[PDB]
Amino acid sequence: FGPQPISRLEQCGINANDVKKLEEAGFHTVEAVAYAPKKELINIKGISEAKADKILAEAAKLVPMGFTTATEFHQRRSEIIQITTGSKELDKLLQGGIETGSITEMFGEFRTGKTQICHTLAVTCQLPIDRGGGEGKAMYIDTEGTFRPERLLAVAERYGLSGSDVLDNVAYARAFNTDHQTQLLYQASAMMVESRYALLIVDSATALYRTDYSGRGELSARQMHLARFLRMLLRLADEFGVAVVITNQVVAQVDGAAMFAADPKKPIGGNIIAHASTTRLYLRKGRGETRICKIYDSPCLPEAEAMFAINADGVGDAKD
Amino acid sequence: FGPQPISRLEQCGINANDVKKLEEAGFHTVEAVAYAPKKELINIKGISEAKADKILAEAAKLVPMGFTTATEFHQRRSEIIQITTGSKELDKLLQGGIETGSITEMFGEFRTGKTQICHTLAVTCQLPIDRGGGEGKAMYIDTEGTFRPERLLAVAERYGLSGSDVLDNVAYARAFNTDHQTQLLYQASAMMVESRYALLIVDSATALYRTDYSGRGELSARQMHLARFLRMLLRLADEFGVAVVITNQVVAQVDGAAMFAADPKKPIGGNIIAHASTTRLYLRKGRGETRICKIYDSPCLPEAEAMFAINADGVGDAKD
Amino acid sequence: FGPQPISRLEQCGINANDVKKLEEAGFHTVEAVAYAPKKELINIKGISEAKADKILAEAAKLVPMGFTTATEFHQRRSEIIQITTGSKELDKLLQGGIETGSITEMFGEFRTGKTQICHTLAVTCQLPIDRGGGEGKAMYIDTEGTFRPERLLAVAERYGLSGSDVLDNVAYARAFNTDHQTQLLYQASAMMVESRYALLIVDSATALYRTDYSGRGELSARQMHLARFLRMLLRLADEFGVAVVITNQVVAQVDGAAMFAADPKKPIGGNIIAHASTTRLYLRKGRGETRICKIYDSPCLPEAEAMFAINADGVGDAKD
Amino acid sequence: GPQPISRLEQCGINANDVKKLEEAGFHTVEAVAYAPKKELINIKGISEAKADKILAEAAKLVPMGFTTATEFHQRRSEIIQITTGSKELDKLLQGGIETGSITEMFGEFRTGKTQICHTLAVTCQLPIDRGGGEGKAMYIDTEGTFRPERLLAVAERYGLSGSDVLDNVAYARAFNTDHQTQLLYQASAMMVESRYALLIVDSATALYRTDYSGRGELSARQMHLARFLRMLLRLADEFGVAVVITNQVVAQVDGAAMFAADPKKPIGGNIIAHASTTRLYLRKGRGETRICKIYDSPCLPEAEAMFAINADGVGDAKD
Amino acid sequence: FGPQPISRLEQCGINANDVKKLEEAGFHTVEAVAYAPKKELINIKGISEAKADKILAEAAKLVPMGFTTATEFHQRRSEIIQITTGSKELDKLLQGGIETGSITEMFGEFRTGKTQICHTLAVTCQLPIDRGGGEGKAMYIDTEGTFRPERLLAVAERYGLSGSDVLDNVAYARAFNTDHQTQLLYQASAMMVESRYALLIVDSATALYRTDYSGRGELSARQMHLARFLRMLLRLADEFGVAVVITNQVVAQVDGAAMFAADPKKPIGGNIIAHASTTRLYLRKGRGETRICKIYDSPCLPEAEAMFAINADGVGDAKD
Amino acid sequence: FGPQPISRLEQCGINANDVKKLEEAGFHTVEAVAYAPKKELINIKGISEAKADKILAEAAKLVPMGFTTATEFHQRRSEIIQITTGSKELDKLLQGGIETGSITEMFGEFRTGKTQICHTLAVTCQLPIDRGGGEGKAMYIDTEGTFRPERLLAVAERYGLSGSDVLDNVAYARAFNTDHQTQLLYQASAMMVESRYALLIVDSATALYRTDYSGRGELSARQMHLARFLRMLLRLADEFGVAVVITNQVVAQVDGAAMFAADPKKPIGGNIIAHASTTRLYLRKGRGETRICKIYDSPCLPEAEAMFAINADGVGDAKD
Ligand SMILES: Nc1ncnc2c1ncn2[C@@H]1O[C@H](COP(=O)(O)OP(=O)(O)O)[C@@H](O)[C@H]1O
Ligand SMILES: Nc1ncnc2c1ncn2[C@@H]1O[C@H](COP(=O)(O)OP(=O)(O)O)[C@@H](O)[C@H]1O
Ligand SMILES: Nc1ncnc2c1ncn2[C@@H]1O[C@H](COP(=O)(O)OP(=O)(O)O)[C@@H](O)[C@H]1O
Ligand SMILES: Nc1ncnc2c1ncn2[C@@H]1O[C@H](COP(=O)(O)OP(=O)(O)O)[C@@H](O)[C@H]1O
Ligand SMILES: [K+]
Ligand SMILES: [K+]
Ligand SMILES: [K+]
Ligand SMILES: [K+]
Ligand SMILES: [K+]
Ligand SMILES: [K+]
Ligand SMILES: [Mg+2]
Ligand SMILES: [Mg+2]
Ligand SMILES: [Mg+2]
Ligand SMILES: [Mg+2]
Numbered sequence A, B, C, E, F: 001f002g003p004q005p006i007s008r009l010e011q012c013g014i015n016a017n018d019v020k021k022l023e024e025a026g027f028h029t030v031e032a033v034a035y036a037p038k039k040e041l042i043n044i045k046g047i048s049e050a051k052a053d054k055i056l057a058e059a060a061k062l063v064p065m066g067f068t069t070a071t072e073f074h075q076r077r078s079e080i081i082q083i084t085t086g087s088k089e090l091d092k093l094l095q096g097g098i099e100t101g102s103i104t105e106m107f108g109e110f111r112t113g114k115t116q117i118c119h120t121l122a123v124t125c126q127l128p129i130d131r132g133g134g135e136g137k138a139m140y141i142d143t144e145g146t147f148r149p150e151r152l153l154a155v156a157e158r159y160g161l162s163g164s165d166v167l168d169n170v171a172y173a174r175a176f177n178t179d180h181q182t183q184l185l186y187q188a189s190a191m192m193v194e195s196r197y198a199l200l201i202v203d204s205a206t207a208l209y210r211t212d213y214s215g216r217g218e219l220s221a222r223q224m225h226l227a228r229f230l231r232m233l234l235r236l237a238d239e240f241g242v243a244v245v246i247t248n249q250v251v252a253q254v255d256g257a258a259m260f261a262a263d264p265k266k267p268i269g270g271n272i273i274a275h276a277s278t279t280r281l282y283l284r285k286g287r288g289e290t291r292i293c294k295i296y297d298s299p300c301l302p303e304a305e306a307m308f309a310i311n312a313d314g315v316g317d318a319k320d
Numbered sequence D: 001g002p003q004p005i006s007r008l009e010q011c012g013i014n015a016n017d018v019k020k021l022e023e024a025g026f027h028t029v030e031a032v033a034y035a036p037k038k039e040l041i042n043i044k045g046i047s048e049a050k051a052d053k054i055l056a057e058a059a060k061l062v063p064m065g066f067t068t069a070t071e072f073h074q075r076r077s078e079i080i081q082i083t084t085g086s087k088e089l090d091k092l093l094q095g096g097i098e099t100g101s102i103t104e105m106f107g108e109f110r111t112g113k114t115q116i117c118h119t120l121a122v123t124c125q126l127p128i129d130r131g132g133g134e135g136k137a138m139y140i141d142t143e144g145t146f147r148p149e150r151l152l153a154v155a156e157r158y159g160l161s162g163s164d165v166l167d168n169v170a171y172a173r174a175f176n177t178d179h180q181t182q183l184l185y186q187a188s189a190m191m192v193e194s195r196y197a198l199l200i201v202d203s204a205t206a207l208y209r210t211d212y213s214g215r216g217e218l219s220a221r222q223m224h225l226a227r228f229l230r231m232l233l234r235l236a237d238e239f240g241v242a243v244v245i246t247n248q249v250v251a252q253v254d255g256a257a258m259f260a261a262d263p264k265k266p267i268g269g270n271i272i273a274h275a276s277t278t279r280l281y282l283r284k285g286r287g288e289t290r291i292c293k294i295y296d297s298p299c300l301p302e303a304e305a306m307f308a309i310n311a312d313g314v315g316d317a318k319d
């Protein structure tokens, strides 16, 4: 069960031309138009103030957005699914795994294993819910050109799942530039409503912005575009109940006039949207053959560290 | 003990149709009518100038609006209720804690514990006056998806209160956009008049405004909407005599990126309403894993500093 | 030495019902009737042209209004009272302090100590003339909610006055909206006829007009209402001879709301009344401390600057 | 100068009519002669024949016939011009502020009109040798912005006794328009009583903005202003004194859709536009220098001038 | 099978001036303009925003950029061409050799054998697919002045190919400075679009940057120029599908400054483009005459070590 | 057959002042202008970006810098002259002798015979082509003061050439410190164009650096200065088509400091410029006379050892 398709609004007395204009705009379900303010609906053409007000009021009638007791919210948060990361120690660290309905930014230095974690999450997302999975196909928006299905086949063989259907479930695309990356979100929102999607990996979020928006005086436009991208990701996560995972690259100190996100502090959203990343995981190589994952910031989980390893079957517990 | 419900206004020779029009307008209390100029009581359709003047007559007759001797105001202020922050050092710094019937704006950089302080205030608000509480249900309006009842349960366990009853009082809502944030206050007013409440937290005020109203030419509309929201908050604070707490994120250095509200000057209301925040607290990160709270501005308190820490049971005194 | 009560007009043979009509209109004094034009005495229903003309003629006979030699005006001006501001440097800057029977506007951005200056003036107003006081009770139409009767006690302790008695002679009111602020002037005119008052403080005098009259097309009504309020204040200053201090906010950047009078361009009254503020002081924050008060405009004073400080005992001389 | 109204008793008119005319406002036979039949009839207690004959003898006493142009040139060459206190501004006006006319100096807020009025009032008692008027001065102030300290300072600069100049300046304050009109009546009586040379109205349109507010009262405001300016013109023509008035002007956008904030549209309005003979635009400059531009004059041409305000009054631009 | 020439853009209704403007800008192929962002198309003078959006819209329908199932990507990657390196051990370690469409950065100490590998790869690129080749012309943008066709003749004689035709199918150029390198790539784009190419070699990529961009202050500009060069190489590899090989030099004792590479870590692209090199090979000279290759970094291949030898006919299997 | 002198410029519209500014900066031919980047043409003061771009474009139009078929490069390299070393054994070892256009470096222990090889090469540079010479005058930049113009006469008498003409065709200069070496290179480049010069000998390249740039912490500046000197030598070799020979001193023990010019590894250019020495020769003195020359590093020639001897007439084959 998920959102309510926009066709329900047709049952409420709205002519189909406005519905199709909203569909072209990008709002595919009643949730996406209910959550939108009057300004966004007014900005698109062919709609007047009265029509926008009536559709907004009807949508608010359809989906409840009023107050509720905290016990109801505790019950609701006790039913969301957490996706196992493939490692028992990291699963213990995350108190269940990667939660669905938020943003889990995992960042670290170069050659640490973020892509391996993304691969393992994408394959384990198809597991039955009783084994820690999410019972849903997993998308993969890839900007680094670093998607090799051989790892997915290896992990699917390890877990015993049929490789054919595991491959047939995971979708794929590539982002050659920032605008194509953004339009991929429109396509994903269009194509999500037709099936059950429980994961969406963007590896990595900031890779294209370090190069395309290269310039001392281009910082402002880059920041606004990144904020828009992150807002779209947040809306997608809230609307469809998916588990968005992204990736960032970091390095000691900084370079340039505070241009990149190469800092443990100063999250990806920066000064515009600081609350974008609900969960942040620092991935560190450590000393010797070690791998460490530390919860840098979480609203509920406390700071801690953990040990894990990467073998030919994916990410697993550190074998001694 | 509280305000006078508008049903008491019925015993003045006024028919119920315009009374219901005022009720649906947003004036749930006779005080909300007495604190309203003729312009706002006329702007609602269906009411003439003579009717508005007639109702305002007995509305002002019901409540005292005349001059009082300064000793009377000192007597009134000495009986005000202050809410303990949960830390003795902060209690000393604020000379009693967060005072009721006013606005306290806590602002600081990213990851300074503002949400933790809001959680601790929301749980300690339920304590009886004997222990320093306010003896009333709280209210939380969240604009970042950063409400975790686990912290509330932990603090309730620490203070000895029954967690089930503690979680059964704190209301909750989420603001997906600025218009929903503004609209929440209308239902909040009815919920406030219905039952005793003693704390309204809005975490955080200027979080959505950085996102929805992104644009050089949209600054004026953003400023007017923020001024309207803060005026509504001030009316709420004056009406039911409950403490309003708001939260603001500020970048350490002057990042720029056109005009913003992230600077240790220029209060939230801006140039239109520079007086919205009665009390202003600056939350700062010390050199070595320390937290400091500095009273940036108070009409009666002097500038000072304090030390505090955050443990698994909430905010508390600085443990050496 | 004060004004003659309107009841004296009853000795002129006029019918007492007309006297009560004038009293309820707002003219509590014979001087108020004398200064009024024919149209304002006719606009109230129940009074004919002949009656208004005869009371106006008798009032003009009672209080002289003809030409006087300039030496007489110099003698009258040399006997005026000046209220010490609590700082010797500022006292030298003002060539005596704040004069009675005049309007003193104070400029200032956010956090410039205007409220502290108002508090010190209100607590030094009841000082005997021997120490530069006014020997009269004070008033405070506080439209900001920032009136804390804790600084008044501190300054009273500094000056040796009994705290209970100095707190016992201060009138206080709060303005929640523009119309209530205006009616407070009628109430104050009612009060001052029966006791010696020597100060009227309005801090601020423009915030409510900033918030309530928010609109491009509402500017004209705002300007007319502000002009009416300032005219009422000027009349109050003329009749009873009380120094009227008013506080106006200011900002050093763009406004974007047409007039939006927060800048040095003209008095608060603006184009309609650019002459209400007899004296104008600009309060500015220097480097570090020791704010500067500059005489921005005065009929008989030159441009100058001064240094002053704010301690726990109130405003005082700057100590290096 | 003017002939006192008592000379009318040489004709033989019953003195009750003379007293009626005196209490009406006409304290000089010239005032009766200039008045038309309608005004002399509107006052009750006078018959048509009496008004006609009194106008006949008034015209007999006061010459109103045609005069050759050279006679008018000779009359105008004997006029007195009051020095403005600044030599450069004096050269701009080709003699200074003339008498028997109206000089309206208008400008934005904080230009120095009140200081100019003080300097004109203190230089008026100067003897004609220095370019003064030798007469007394009057100040009908509608703003409470009259400070004798500046008069004392400027008198000290010009080497006069402060007590004497102080004792030769009549002062009054106007709280409303009707009080201003009654002040004009009392000023007329006082000026027929004794010699005066200057009459200052600072400012003329200050009270009309506050008193006659609202859109629906514009016609009454215009009529009252026209009556006030007509009375001022009659005063100027009667006793031959220099009348100076002050007006405020701004370049607002939406603060008012009416009023008199305009460089054009003279103070007299559309009813009597010819009220102000001379008009001076007083403008704030860029760095520190104020300018005085002759906006309109029957004889003087358009020009500009440099002047400064010092603690001793108004003087030349000290670079 | 090759890229679609830019002339097809005129088939969509674009006047020839814009087509020639794009051609002179550097976009010789519809793939290049399709992959380009809106900002880069706007930057060239002579095209409006609407015109650029229209061109992008028509180009989108020509090349599919939407989502696709992972099985489609596995099919696409199964048919990719791998170029034999001339050594059986190297071929086994690389699981086919050097893969087209990706960057294979080989680096090592001085006199390790990178130039010989590049020479042998250039010869073997002309072999038909039946013998592990790619049957395509090769290029050599040599910057060290270390191109000797005698090795090419020797390898062609070993493989039995005619020397004349082997020489005739290799294009050569020399780079004297960085801007010449960039313009050389600009010309190489047109040369590639004019015919069929399969291998590009840059030996070495960073040699000229050590000569030109020296000094302590010239740190940023060198990094941006290198990032631009690597972005150009990536665009070429994606758009034409040509195996790109670049050479880097490393040392064990970095006795220099911050403007160095000198590290097995810190790839050539640096912190701006860490993902520039898809495959990374480390070449070392062990004790005696052993020559070892190691997969330093690969998205799919695991870490391994292999032995190889260099003899008179190029790189061959290490004879015991 | 030489370069194109800068007098061929000034016909493109560039005024004579810019030409003279380039002339005084060390750019004595159009080849040195074409090979230079924008940085080295902007660093000289008096030239703007537009003028530099125009002159660079004209220079690029003057000389061919585009791609070419490998057969063209083979044909070009077939006609490259190689100067005989005076010994048949070493001539066969070098496959023709010292090639023209590359930096040929020779090094060995003390008293091994490099200097005698330098005189023999200088004298043979004057021989006609059919005798193995280069038909060009020679230059000798001697740093250790070991240039005796008496072996030249002996070897010239051996070859039958007149002694006076042989001496008159050798331009000799001495370098006392590094900056003098650089300025003398500037002068040599200035005086190179006006005659046919085929050989340029530096003996030795690093002797002055060892005894001038002492100090443990001064290695970096010495390294950068050596890199600049070697870049200048490379530009001289490429631009004028001259044969550059330089001498290095080595000690077969290890090292005496952190950085040194010793060790058979670690070429003179260091890890900054490792490709400066195209051909490297190692000279050894074994048991008995046994003077051996070995090709250490070469891009085309293989490793081999040859026997030579030094006689009173110069250097010849080892007598039996
Ligand atoms: N086939 C593989 N089997 C096991 N580990 C692998 C394999 N391929 C790569 N790795 C590991 O991946 C690590 C780097 O993580 P990777 O996902 O390749 O890069 P990134 O840091 O860019 O996310 C390396 O340390 C290596 O040990
Ligand atoms: N109890 C106090 N004792 C001394 N100074 C105080 C005290 N409370 C506030 N202040 C001073 O008041 C200043 C601001 O003046 P205030 O009147 O509160 O504000 P504003 O001018 O905005 O109305 C602050 O800079 C602070 O130093
Ligand atoms: N005592 C004084 N001495 C000299 N100049 C003064 C004095 N008082 C005020 N001024 C000057 O008066 C100028 C404003 O002129 P004023 O007549 O007060 O204004 P307005 O044109 O608004 O009636 C100010 O620029 C100031 O410099
Ligand atoms: N003609 C040749 N035949 C065989 N090996 C050669 C030949 N020329 C050079 N080499 C080899 O080249 C190696 C070093 O040179 P090279 O491979 O070009 O290094 P680099 O890539 O660092 O320039 C030597 O170990 C030598 O064995
Ligand atoms: K966070
Ligand atoms: K404040
Ligand atoms: K003024
Ligand atoms: K990589
Ligand atoms: K020697
Ligand atoms: K080499
Ligand atoms: Mg990765
Ligand atoms: Mg937060
Ligand atoms: Mg204040
Ligand atoms: Mg004035």
Ligand SMILES: [Mg+2]
Binding pocket: E114, E115, E144, E146
């Ligand atoms: Mg090499």
Ligand SMILES: [Mg+2]
Binding pocket: F114, F115, F146
């Ligand atoms: Mg030697």
